[PDB]
Amino acid sequence: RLTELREDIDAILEDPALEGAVSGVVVVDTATGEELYSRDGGEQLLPASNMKLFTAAAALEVLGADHSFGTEVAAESAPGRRGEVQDLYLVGRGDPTLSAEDLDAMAAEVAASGVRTVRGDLYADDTWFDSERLVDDWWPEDEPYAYSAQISALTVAHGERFDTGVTEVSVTPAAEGEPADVDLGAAEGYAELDNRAVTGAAGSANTLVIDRPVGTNTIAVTGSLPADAAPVTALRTVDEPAALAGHLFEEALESNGVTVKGDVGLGGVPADWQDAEVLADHTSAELSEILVPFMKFSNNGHAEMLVKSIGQETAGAGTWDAGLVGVEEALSGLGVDTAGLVLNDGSGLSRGNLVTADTVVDLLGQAGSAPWAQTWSASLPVAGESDPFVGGTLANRMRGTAAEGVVEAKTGTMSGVSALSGYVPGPEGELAFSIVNNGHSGPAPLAVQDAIAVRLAEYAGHQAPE
Ligand SMILES: *[B-](O)(O)CNC(=O)c1ccccc1[N+](=O)[O-]
Ligand SMILES: [Mg+2]
């Protein structure tokens, strides 16, 4: 039975789609410590988003399941009889789920607390982390897309998925031959518009490209949208998330009857402020709850912010250098051998990251007996579950198989890297597995990973739901 399983997995990895790839595959029974299957377990490979497994475990170790993040509005003293303040400060301490509604609810507080006029300027203070926005080796050409959003302690998160530091762009066709309408979302009046797009004839080809040219805060829209095409929406990052959060706050203020007479810009609460007047605050939900959208959908913003938040907890330094050491320390504290690990970011976006399949399984083991185990697995995608906040990146994989509803694992994909690691529970034991593929040339070997996951589900005594 053990050997049958082994031979099957051997054959599954015989797949042509893994030509010239190195593949780390490790499976361990977690009740007993038995090594059911091991191949290139010690080989160092890029992990893509499997890196979050590490990040998420450290954050729970360091910040705690119950941790929350705050944001405040501050003036040098409370407002007058006349309800006036000079400069106003929006100060973010790394909430990765600050919505536009929260900015609105905070603008109402500022009004309820008796401010009717900001006489001076409004500043957005994201100084709680440093201003290193992107990791060294992240690719400039990727900077327009949501997963590559700049990192700040003050960032507005869009939608129920909480994609930070982006804006929704929507392009509606008009009459054939007239320019397409471009709607910039939250970034209206913040990010610049270069609209070159046109409405093509009904039934013609869709060639619409939405971009943000490197080193600009301009949304450049080119190509042709068919007169009859459905409106197109795209998440595009903006330069300086905090300044957009600032921009949005001025609008929430004016909206809640508070007139801002100055400019909007970046700035930290001055040192020479004796006893700042906190005129509004927001508290995020707790880390346990935040893990869901972070891990289910592989949020890269959330990952880096958690790192910088760890840097803050361990060293009062909201920094990659500080946070990564923080992660490695936490993981050691956990019992994980971090020999094979090379940490270059929290998200896995970076090609400077290295894991081994043994280390991953190692982590999976330790996380299983940690007091925060449950909130940890709850965050992982569940195979073939169609409710996005349950299935996450595994929503449309392995449906109608023994793995459906059972396998909990994290995914990982970019050019020539794919990964799947997590658990198979069952009538046998709770299995921890890691599959990391590097160097394949075609599409990610998703079928190959599925096959393994499914056979492990069957080995743990599961059957495909019909
Ligand atoms: B992870 O999500 O497995 C690593 N992948 C990414 O960060 C990612 C996600 C979504 C789109 C692109 C992309 N890239 O790394 O290019
Ligand atoms: Mg605006």
Ligand SMILES: [Mg+2]
């Ligand atoms: Mg089942």
